[model samples]
Target: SDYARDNSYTKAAEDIDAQYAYSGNDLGVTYTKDATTFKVWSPTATGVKLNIFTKGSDDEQGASKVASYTLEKMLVDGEWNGVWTITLVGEWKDYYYTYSVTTTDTTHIGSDATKTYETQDVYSTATGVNGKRSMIVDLDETDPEGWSNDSHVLLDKSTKSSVWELHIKDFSYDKASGVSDANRGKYLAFTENGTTLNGEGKVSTCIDYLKELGVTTVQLNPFYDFQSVNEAGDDSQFNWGYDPVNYNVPEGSYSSNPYDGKVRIKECKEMIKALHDAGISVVMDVVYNHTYSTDSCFQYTVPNYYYRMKTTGAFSDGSGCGNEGATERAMYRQYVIDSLKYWVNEYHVDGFRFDLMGLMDVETMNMAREALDQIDPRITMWGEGWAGGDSYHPTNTCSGTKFYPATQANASRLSDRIAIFNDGIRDGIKGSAMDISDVGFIQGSKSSAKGVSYGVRANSSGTYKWKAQAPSQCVTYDACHDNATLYDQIIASTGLADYGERNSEAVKMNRLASAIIYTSQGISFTLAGEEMARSKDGDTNSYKSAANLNMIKWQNVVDYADVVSYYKGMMQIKSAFSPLTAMDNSYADKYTFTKKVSASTNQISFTIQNDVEGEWNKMAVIYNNATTAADVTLSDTSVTDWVVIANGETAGLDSLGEVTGSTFTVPARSAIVAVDKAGYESAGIHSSKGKVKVNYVYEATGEKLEDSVILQGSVGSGYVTVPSAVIPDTYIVSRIGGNAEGKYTSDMQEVTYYYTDYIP
Candidate 1:
């Protein structure tokens, strides 16, 4: 019943995967000191030839010819594997290589005809200018200083990461970025230390600015070798690099010298190292689901074996990129896994954001996760959990007997470590990124309140069956590289020609969106310049926009300083507050939605009660999008007085003022983040914090042990600490190895202690 009916490329692909799938890891060029081993996998090929050249060129005819050898098929036992191999017994480290595969072209739409394709390796780690040829690079030479010791910033969970998505060219393409002319729009731009705006050291740019803004991770927009931009040409051309050519090699255009393949490798490593040293993890935006075109390296090697094909012999365009990789096939699955591991092991990338993972199989994703875990459990993986278009076979499968892609609908089949972007929450908060005119919660529309409410719990609430299995499996964002900036979204949605002043309506809407995402329980993601009110002059899709439109103009940092402050403050607060992004689904109980100001208004509020005792244990956050200010009441009657830490204009650990009662008025078109009265006392705004006695209870002996400790805290402090010396030991009490941490209150605070001693 499962057999393919057509006598087309689809049937041929199934047969190829079953007959000739190679299990060897060494598929590409494996260089040794004495000799070099070259391997290519093409079971359908009748003959194969290895072409080596002295000089690499964009045009095949222009390259300086060196030598060509007919590769021999490798035989294991009595059977021949798909692998074709040849060994060169000399040092050929810097020479370029390509494969001339002579095979019957059974491409779904094309007629079956024997043809020869001259192409580079699909798993090329180093490529020459424009990625026209594969270069043999000694990877050991590409390492920067302390490359071995370079490690990802320790994160307790994937949810703790704050992602700032940035394109390499956009970071320093503008004159205002203050990066040197030599490094601008290059990988070395991130290597530049203490860059400033217009040489004014007071205003930071590039790497310095990222550190100051305090993001935990920097997600780069595809640094892999792509086909759209000419690497050897001038920097006048710009692209977001969604068109993937070589999956492993760094994009040559980002290097100072594209002609030198080794230069890009070293510079890309330098960028990652620079970001790592600045306490930032690097996540590479990977496009494994599709290649730039069907006539790519994958096609050149094995014809239609690498692509999804319809019964009519046309390529299945699930990726919307003309061709989608057949990730369900054994060899294509191997390619995906190998490519992912290469990025982690070779490039030292901490994470990956798959471009169109939905086009890939669920088994491949889980398999990749399992492989990556063996290398480093800290490596994070997530993607857009939806395909771009329809598929030829869209049923969920893993055993190769059926075809099923890894879409959000099948997220339960995936490892919990893999996260998916929450488009529901994004659209609910700031309208559809695809359609600017669509209004959402922040745009004074209560229509999406339920969806926004679902996101408030990180899509883990039992109220509805959500896409993610846990909070860590959800990534929340309002806008990304594919859409207009949040500011632009607001302006365009409001039918305005341009954004107003710094504290305009659009700015407030942006802040409200930021406040919700940061405070919500999930991984927070933001486009690099979104915090500073970036605008592309109303361009919705800026993937191929000019340098002027795509670059992060540093002048906006000076102009929208307050908006930047709000974004930074939200990040700081989110980092300080652990309960907001709790990993477990049990944490959903902590969030309780309160009644709105009115059913007609789009105002919403919620309270988060912290179970683990600390300063600001209880918080009430309100978002009022109504034109007029609304009076909000606290649903949790346990606390009366509240401290306002974040208002519309600012947000941080600092307190704005005190509101005494169950009800308080939230400003119009803004948000308010307030904590219990104990939070204010913990801030130590007064002369000094009040001292409290923590009583230890010995349950076995039924004895009460009292200890005196001063809760030490100051203004702008996120925590109130008690000295370890003054508190009872963990065996004597319930303390966890160190200082006895508790909240500070003006009145006597009751501290409950526990005993770890066992008794019968």
Candidate 2:
């Protein structure tokens, strides 16, 4: 009987797809000057009616309903395909409406029961307060200033993007955040560019801090219409917004005026415009894998067709959120694609981060990618390629065919354009996500070096690689919103219990962890406050925690300013060094392990040989995880001199020192970066003496042509000669003047080289 019941539902899911697959974009409300047309797909609905309300909070008990009309069924190809439609003449803008669908209660499992469910449209882009009713809005009026010129900050490749994950509330909830009272914890907070830390006009906070930190993308946590927190309530409530109610609408709680639906839409657009103006792109965290409850609009309209079920008629719990969407189904697949396009088209989102991508099917994800490419080929997409729990239908074999789930195990089946989080490297850097007590490479775990090394090479397939086919197919990070902060993890595994020592150790480990991520060959990501040693008092899961636990304390930014400086230095290095950001499918050709720095010393050493960007000819990074300092020697001694940019304490483009003998002592629990001295000198990055300006002039008239270039080095060193490639082919050197080929001096020197026409 159970088999027959489950089989009947599965068979019905296929039949529904075959009969009711509507590809038209007019399913939601379509507005024009003539009339407003409303449409919905509900095949099993016995009756459908539209209820119009005068106000957003109005209900049937309050008698706020202005009108009601029964929807008509539409026929396609001379057959009913479950599409309901009704067009109301005259303008209905700014009005709130809902659909009342009367259908059989399929959740009863073989029992015959009828129920009428009233809910807002799943395709709503604007909703008031807690999203009880969908509001009709003219999207053209919701644009902020400069909306037409807003565009994404494109990168050479997706892997080159440095991302910072932030939560909207955590950004400006604290008084120390220095945000105005009216704008605090709202979308308008991002618009305050000159905001300071703790109202002290000295240091920058929020948007300015992001700009100074040099991250290209900001991955915002879910800000969609969610059900947990009361929108009209005060600021005491906090939610991560993972429990999405409306996928298309922005959350009302993030808007200052939650009562007005249009205000939320406009404020969200303003936030995006501000971020774009700051040269930062926005990546939305989309949770399309599941909904907050089974009593959702999709559930009422199509019954059991929207969710995956076990043989016992229970909803699948792969997402660990009670259920997972049936992405293999055609209509459900369409919803995911449509929702993504709507965010990009209306909100100008630059990218997406799927919450639980593994639960989705490969076909659906590929199709979404193809559809998005048709809109903007540069829109980056990445996600968690693992489910929270064992998925129910990992390999759904319906209609005599199999559907492959988009999990890490099946990465090859999905498009290479999509990226998945490198969990192996994340765990390797700071221990297990579930256990804070466990330690990693930075915490003196010798075993973790192998895993961390795998991440350094971008998780590509090789001797020590993970599942990625290319370097860009992985997002490398040590901490994100889902787990404990890097500071807390360091505190938990410091081995010493003294608070002062633990705190001090955490600062160093934070720098070390961030250095590894930025130097690694993949998309760099870090938690918002991870750079400045932010903490939550050891609360690993603070999704529903109080503001005190979730808010980003700006005081940490002031107290640990050195750590922030270190993060900024790492970002600068990642941008300046070509090998760190430039990579193709194969990383093995560019990266190699230096065998001299043996694992016996609890250290790992690697070098990137290809400098295609011409910023650096060669680069080497050595990490020390031992309790005591270790002497690291390069395996290849042919490269005589190396410029030490980072010496485990501080780093930048400026040289910390030089390693002449190919050997250097690296401090315990830290890392050091070394670049070929030839590369550094060739780029003219760290010249101490005055510059030597070379001027090209015409020999016939002795008239100056233009300033060619400048060369600088040590004060007492010989003047460097210009390369032949810089000289014009048709010109011949006639004479030199003005301190020509003079030895280095304290004063800035200039040389003029006269050129004449070639007579050969």
Candidate 3:
């Protein structure tokens, strides 16, 4: 009885189709109602029929109305076809329906024909209205509006992400304090012998230290299962956890109980929970980019599908770590995405900091962001955008250059937002020194100045002036355990320090450098020990030495409380000035250095005015990086009573007197922030005399380019002619370098240039 209730059958035939042969092939039907239409395509049937039924008793089925829809047969190309059309006369909201086609020949039967034939063509039934996930929050719900409801939402207000990239290999748990992982909250390290915890067998105070450091997010080195010692047995077993043995289990070396793998996860989660209780977010520093130098259980499980292999049957070294994971493949991508979700959902991690992210393509990153967003929007997603080391890498696929553009493009492409470590600003401000020769190019050097100047210009490809733009950038100190610490960089660049001794001049230089970082545009990041002048001797790259990385000296925090306070004040100022974070970058030119008079350049002054009325008030920051008191002046007199918000010498904001004759004496190697009074207005401070104007001509064609009028100020500018393949058109004249004065003129005829038919 139950089987009969679940199945039914019907049959129909047309008088015009009486002569049709039942070969059991090709049958289809079509139905239409208002603007909605449905079509069925079946190419293996002899004859087809459409049966209509009503929702009533089965006994009344014989009395139900039967509508015979019209069927049209036509020849499609070289093949014959049959189509049926049926129109409903009544309106239906929630109606159930299924297709019933019968073949004249008994050779072909329905999908389930044990009892009564039932076609597999039934439409999906709706229990009620489709419901969306409860965790999803509409953009309208966020303050000032967020990305759309459908946009990928990664980090949000509740869950904040932070980085703890530096790891010490020799760090050990404070056995006395019962804290097994000694390097839990600090920068980890690796040594020539192996990984060691800081102050091994001593009590660790990392949790309290991190809390005091004002960091809410933490990521640690790989603590997955690993061998305690290598074949050499020289204690060089620490390899920064790149040598992963298992994915689901924790490493035994870092845990007190080597045999019990659960302690590692338990200790890690306890540390994470402690951080969470302190309002800090925890993220795992995952190394999905590549595995260790050797093959292990991972390869045994997934084989070549998990890693990228060269066509010649060799390992692909695109990640520069001797092997590159095949992230482009769907299986690998899904594996990573699933792994990340597992960490977030199971362990309650805030987010993940992907190492060597450039090895993976944009699609993989997008998929990860999407999945992570589904779980939590506030999870922090960020990492090194570039791949390190040498593998036959293509353009923009490695780290450094890859990070900025990829991050920018990702931010543009998806709603699951993440920030990339801004090595651009770092290298731009403080040059890279992986090798000793790189010291010459560090920030504060001549080469660094030129390179940064050019980069600042290039960042303005779509803007009016190159210097006035902010390219959706990130700012950071030396990243992770790869290179020298900030203090080491200062010493190397200045050549003042001997061994581990701190140089006073280096300290001053370091303060000035930090001041520049605080005032500079974009998000700012600090290496764990940079605030307290942390250093790693002369060892520039310390990835293998974990003992060198340890818990930051808390006394340094006390000693440099002034510097910490200054940094906090700067962050506060940045947060208050929302315009500083806007996409538009028309305000950068106001800070360009105009002149260097005999190396004793005085009267350092620049002009900044709000372009949008009632938006942002004019503010200026002047730093006398030189050692002696210098007389500074504001070009705009309307900036009355400049308050000393932060002095590199002092920690807090101190209000100074009004701008007497637009001039004030600034302390040597010190920085000052001047904010305009609420209602202050500037009439004569509209333009600058230092601005330069240039007229450009296309190289291939004898044509003048408009807006190609580059500003040749102190910062400098570069010019390139339009390519021959480009369309010939007139160019608009615009300013390029330095601060300049100009009248508001939208007239195209004023200074516009045109390309001519002749080639230059």
Candidate 4:
């Protein structure tokens, strides 16, 4: 019936069987010091057996089973239960294990259900050959260098976070990435430090940018093991990783050594810990709602039990994948719970971003919330709240928007830890994600009072719009991987009249859109390339495009560096005045929405007073979307010297050192992030930052220095690093002792003491 994007609720055709229940903690290989106890949960199996292959099956040619063992029905306290178990003591550490259950396997509902079939263990920690083989080993061996005392990056509030989403390969596959050869497209690439792009030369580029750009979380898209690309293929392989093959294992393709039993695990840990050490939390994009192939571990092992099915024996399509996992069932729900915990406890993952999370029912999700909290109290839980449904869910409930909506009469049902991607404000600020013609606020959707007002309040709560019970329950964004990049959308919206390979209005719109989301309340997210006009060359869906197009153009950090600074500045402003993403949100009561006029079109202005005794005293954000510029007047006495934190043009941060007026003007189609100075530390600004360079020209000639020392600085820390040029006129009598030769002198009093720009 083509009811995909429909948000309205309707009962669905479902076969939610509660009786597919089985509880067994020892469901997979449990290595207990000297013994490996293996168990399989198949209540209807006629017989259960194990195949132990000395070598992992890696290709279609197949491998032989080196040893075989029989498993008996679980005897608990000498009583018979449905679970089957077998134990192999000592030295089977690297053995490949696959279980065959003889049951009414495929058509378990029929009398001929007594058949034997081989499949994977749902709880296996590691796998081979697209998850067809489970290897037995201790998880401790997978830990990288400092896995023992590792810690997650702690942030004060999830509400006050800026998350940068990136595909693992899309991060460093480009030559511009300057990442080393072997590690370039692999997970370990994140661990490299000396890598540099052109403009950001002699300094780390990729991961280093996250800290300078001021993002709190690095949300990696689907690093979990998935089926599609061959692990042996040269890193040209690309997929979004939504097609889950094994929920517990890391993908071998992202690892340098795909054939090993432990290399994939080791490298993934390195990638994670490296980001952690850099003071950034890594959020893994998890897809437990469905699998790419029905041959997935949860599927083939126990066919209908793992899938959401109908009376007609067909699988439901809620994830946009052909089948959806049966989260409503007891055992499937347990599997999902087990998978999330395995990642948290075993991998030290800081948070999870579920894909097609709507397919997972509320009870299961809430249970996940309570359970994972035992490991990390502040686990960041977020996902695509909306599903691409070609079919109905087993529960028929909507997970999108504020479902027990805050704006509704019920006015209840918020998450303890989950935040839905703000699709509402996303389209509100930019445009439709799928349509090429529709335009939103930043693109020609100007005078869009609906979008402007909704975004200013951060869609927290208001008469015009509000989507979450608490501000943090929503992740507001303008671009994601599923659709077109925002820049391409803007170009199309303008009929291709405004884009350039350089600074242009389209680029300004890119900055303005980002400014809106980051300054808005709630969690903020930006797709990898959004900060610096990452155009897919107008490709709407480029997940399968060339690796060059898919990867972040590290060169953009050189070409459109201004756009990058704008985003970084916006992020800085967000970090400074965190009350914008504050959770208590009691400050919403003190908010006053005022613009140039009561009837003003294409503009938004609002002020939030500090409700908590923290960073900011009060904050005001003004955005202009009309053809003409406008001034937003401020009258609060609490606001002392106004700090124009960002005036929207780009490059260096615009704490334009304090403004004196009660009003300010924002450029047309631009925005301004200002604060009522939360009391600055007393100091006269001096010793400004720029790169260390020496500009020189032959003073003997009348020529001036032009080719030397470009005023360069990527990292925002330096103490008046001024370059030198041997000027023609002054050089005639030059006797400067502290010249190039002076630096090499043995008695050169080496700049005695240095005070870092860091506020220690």
Candidate 5:
């Protein structure tokens, strides 16, 4: 059985070169002209040769008179080199070539004489023409530039001109009607799995349901094939495709015919088109950080190169899974980029939500962004910031630190712009499940007193110095299937004893969390059932239980219509306010906070100047760390009358009475939005003078660094654009002198420019 074990020469090379083989099944080459260079790897071979033959005119007889070139035994380092280069005179459009190598010391065998391998015959002649073993070079390989038409490698290129515009509504699958209940909530539905759609084999079946909800988009969870078993199959059987098997192929479980790649691709494309016909965008939840424990097809492709490996021949632990990916490497990076493009270009998907994005290094992420922007700039990209397991720690350092920034920080830099699921805002605002302590407040308590105020302060750009840096930042309430639902977290943090007795209290807290998410100054996201008061019955981790995971009660949508309405109205208000929607961090300076007005708990009133002249001086009053109503008054002389926009009280605004004076009483455990009438239409009072007057005094030497720029009329369209001439070489520009409108424009007009070095 082990007859070849003693073949030292052959066995030695095989053992040494087992890790490096040119598995050219999906490989592609692009070369120009008759001066063609060829490369192949055959580690176990004593000698390798490339056989080239001219094509016959009609059958086999006419293939006699073509030139042939042989390769020399070129040595490269300590390894045997198998690469070959040849120059020929004739222009043969079609030719056949294959590798010949000596495996046994005594004999040498060339490829089959009867069969000829064309350079492009790897995948298929039709689809893999350009991807053949032999490549034809038409143009130089281009790096993806950012935000530009030609830029396909980077996300910040001009090619990504499409804005991240979308109309979102609440949606869920209704088993009773076998349709999605888009109209039942906010006209949007986040599907549980692509399997259901795949199982039904007709995306059109849900068209009427989508139309009724007035849905503009649909986000589906991971649809790629994954392993169906866990380590202990009894403990966990099926995952939500989190244990990826193939990134390029659709999951077999989802597809009616998983064996046929063409069918999967076709059906997926049809689904996308169907959604488009219904005027809905399709968002796929993609997993790239890790792969399944078994049946990972990548192992058969380019085993070691595809997955990150440890020194002991084990999988890397960065993803907290069996392995992480070598995303930083150029080859692996290309694989990821290609996979993403395949979906966008071939499947016609609108966007993607990357799962466990934090596990990926920043450079890989940036590369992905560049590729995505080139394919479709309008495609929405979002992801979970934290990866699961030990490797999921926030501070774990990765390679290429200089080239790659943190996920949160890199998201700020990518101009092709991606929305990140902000765990900072989520955990900071809602409080962590492990600890019952309210964020910025006491543990096992609801008072805002000393509750985690960092999030609130950061939300207003009051606490962090970097808040005004990036305004298009993402903040969310909840996300797709995770370790714990919002309700689960509440109960866990509140303690086991406070479970059933505090069901009503839990609902109130959830509503309050929703209010914060909607009113905050960033993007808002929610899980499918969060708004409907869906619960997992305290299951913090439910990825394995598909039965429990997909069973969302449609009736919950009707039961919590009030919460749904609140979200809808908030979204409307958010859409209406240009200042709120604009991704400018400068709006933070317009906010002012009152001193703790209530001694009972941590209650404060914060006001945001609209900057625009109108009777809508928007202000938000937050009663943190408090259990009862608190009396508060605005000290700003600019504010005259107040109108209640939202309140914690169950009664209508009319029942709360009008603002008789500058003073108002806010209900406990509530956040109130009010309009100030007096300072509503104070136009140009704080306008910027088209320039900045900086009085930078150095504390070390008491030296003042003063600079000034000429103020002109509004600089450019859309929003004011600060000229480079005014503040050259400085990324930080401040609006020191301006009226209200001018100030708003000047303050918000900061832009960061990137450039490659030119010769001096």
Candidate 6:
């Protein structure tokens, strides 16, 4: 019967009508003065009706029938409209709903008129008891303390972000995470600020760590409601929360109380708001790619309508979760867009990272961008542009188009507002992300050299080696939650036994690889423990691994504090260097990117000179990626003026001091960052990257600002308001004379000073 499963993306690309796409406009259970209106979209069911239960059951999954009402089909829309609606006058919300879907499908075995299947409202912003019954929620009730003031942090560009990815459980799964036993691994955990990790008494962990780390965005993996691990059970079972069962709600397991749907909504909101208050942008990792259970509500209510189907009647496995969602369908695409807006509006999330984005078509992604941009221009999106064959092709799943970024319809057609992960950069820097044995640049393999060279260019030109249309199109990283930590992977390949020996080599390699990512032009992503020697004992795939396998070892943070400090320093360096991250697609032409490898030294050195305004004239990022010592020369910049801002040991605006002359030596298996400091030394002498903080004061009057802002550039001139820039795009007053409470506007518009005479 399921032949295409035996056998399909031949259709729907050109057929889905733009006019017919349905995004909920109060589609679920809505209450009014006159009536309670219910609406649902089901194009294929033979019979469709809503069953309202007046009294709820104490059962875990849903309601036990007490009172009921049947909703009739209605002509709610046009063009093969499939909407059904009904309105019952008076008040109702303590009620729940079940859909009585009659179908000529083999999947739903015992369909009865007197019974309703476990199909919770797909549009429910809140649901009850394991998402089995749709609870009527007054969304206003879900708002936390100052809901009216909830706003997303204003970010000018996506590249300005430094993302830290982690699962919800991993944030506070351990006793040392400083969360209460009940609040641990739940959304409420984020609300517990000032709570310190064990052994580091009085020093904050989690949220405090993020603040100290200075990351702009905290990208959490899969906070959406999922069903892989039951929420009602004890805390022994664990999954990464990727197995999504509901699209529009927060996970009940993440809530302090799973029985009440409202608790999940409010707690999730509090989490986002708390992070926002602490000046961190939050990004939710959404898994609309596939559902955990296919015979689940979305399947039972619509019956093969929500998923991509093969000619064999079996579901498409492009998601590798047994089913690929039919985002190609007009309504399904609208649902995705709608869900995004709902999260941003309700939770105040700054961005979203899609899982397996290649499963979606270009049109849907375009529409999604349009929708999200309308809500908040700062809300950004990016995702995995590749998904290999769920089964061997020419199985409909692989289709050649799904796995390659170059073939991705989203990357090809709608190049705007979409950032695809540059697997080129990932694999180029660290060999293959999947296979253990595939060693890359740091391991002395030059096969990935071409990719590394092109990615540094960010694919601005029609470079065949690069797939990214712009630097923003690339989310570059060597390690993420998907692969084994770069630290563990090193041990797996090196066969080193000592933790100290393994980490010594691992930290060096990590610095080399990470410097490339942090200094490269793109969205910089880092694993939660990538900074230190966080390892899973070489576990390649630890998604379902036990807490012992998954929990981040805080003790490692203490053991490798220097490595941790090195990462912080690199972040500080990147923060002060605008050309490193803030450049747009057009800036690719402004850069002079070149790499040279000599058989004489066996070292590969790449030189980068950005003609982009507000940065050093040139920098030489020399890597000793060989088994021998390497000499790096300042080919572009005057080596006399160039400073060794970073050299394997430490980096940042202030960590390492100036290096004299043109040539410098880097030891085997390490890297160096040398930039022309002459420009900055002329403008201002005191460099600032988050080290011992310095206050921004009036050079003339010697009056200090109320808050010590980390202004970029040296002391004499060329200061930017943020650490994200190297030059003087935004200048804080180097000399603010008189005003007591020198006011910078809400957006920093009416600031201390703005420098227009910026030297390019």
Top model number, lDDT: 2
- Identify the runs in model 4 with alpha carbons over 4 angstroms from their true place: 1-20, 58-64, 77-80, 105-110, 198-200, 390-416, 463-466, 496-500, 595-600, 611-616, 634-641, 651-654, 657-661, 677-760
Q: For residues 1-760, write the lDDT of model 4, one tens digit per residue.
A: 1122211111221122223345665688888777889887766577777888865673534566778899988776775555788888877776788888776543433356476678877777887656668888677878887688788785668877778888889898887888878887888889987567742454336887665566788889888888877776656888887778888889988888777668889989999998888889888899888888776656555656677665456667766678877665566777888888888877778889887766666667777888888877688987876667754444232222222211111213536357877766778778878795568888656545576566555556753333566776778788888888788788888774533343356766787787788777778888886876887777777767787778887766655544665676677667666566677557666667674222435767777776544455666677777666787676454565677666655422335556665577877777876666644332222112232223343344534343232222343422121222122233332222222211112221211111112221
Per-residue alpha-carbon lDDT of model 3 for 342-414, expressed as tens digits? 5665445676767776566666787688888787655666666666644332222112123222333344442
Error of 5 at 615 (Å): 8.9
**Candidates ranked, most accurate by lDDT first:** 2, 1, 4, 6, 5, 3
Report, for all candidates in order, the number of backbone clashes.
3, 0, 57, 2, 55, 13
Residue 65 lDDT, candidate 2, scale 0-100: 79
Sort by TM-score, top down from the best? 2, 1, 4, 6, 5, 3
Q: Write the per-residue lDDT of candidate 5 for residues 1-760, one digit (tens) a residue.
A: 0000122222322333343433232332223455444443332234434545543121344444334445444345755433333444444334544344333211122333222222221111111111112212222222122212211121221111112212121123335324443221112232222222322432211345234223344566666544553221232134556776556555433333332233334444445555555566667788877766522333322234455444334555666666766554444555667778776765567777777676666666777777877766656666765555433121212232333322554554543255666555566556654443334232224333322233443233533212312334454444346656666666666653342222444555565665555555555556655654555566666666644344454444333433433443344344434444445555666556565412224565566666555434565455443566677776654665665655653211111234756676776556566655444234212222122222332234444332211212222311122222222243333333332122314443322222222333
Candidate 6: minimum summed lDDT over ten consecutive residues — where? 711-720
TM-score of 2: 0.87
lDDT of each: 0.77, 0.78, 0.42, 0.66, 0.44, 0.65
What TM-score quantifies how close candidate 1 is to the native fold? 0.86
Candidate 6 has a TM-score of 0.82
**Per-residue lDDT value at 585 in model 3:** 53
RMSD of each: 14.0, 13.5, 24.8, 8.2, 19.6, 11.4
Tens-digit per-residue lDDT, 1-760, candidate 2: 0011235556677777776678887788887768888888887777789988767885323538789999989887789877899999998998888999888743343334768899899788787668988888888889997799888765667778888898898899988889999988889999998887777675678998787667889989998889888987777788888887899999988998877789999999999888889999899999999999988989888788888877667787888889878887778888889999999898888889998888887788888999988988778888988787866662453334567777777777878778888888988888988897789888888777777888886667453434777777788888889878888888887854422222545666777898889898878988888877778878878899997679998876555555666776787788887667755654466566775212433778877775464567777788887777898887766576888887566766778788886677888777899889888887765424444556788879968554344444335544333322334567887887776654557676877788888865
Report the C-alpha displacement of residue 327, candidate 4, in angstroms. Answer: 0.6
Q: Which 10-residue span in candidate 2 carries the lowest summed lDDT?
A: 717-726
Q: Which residue pairs clash within candidate 2? A: none
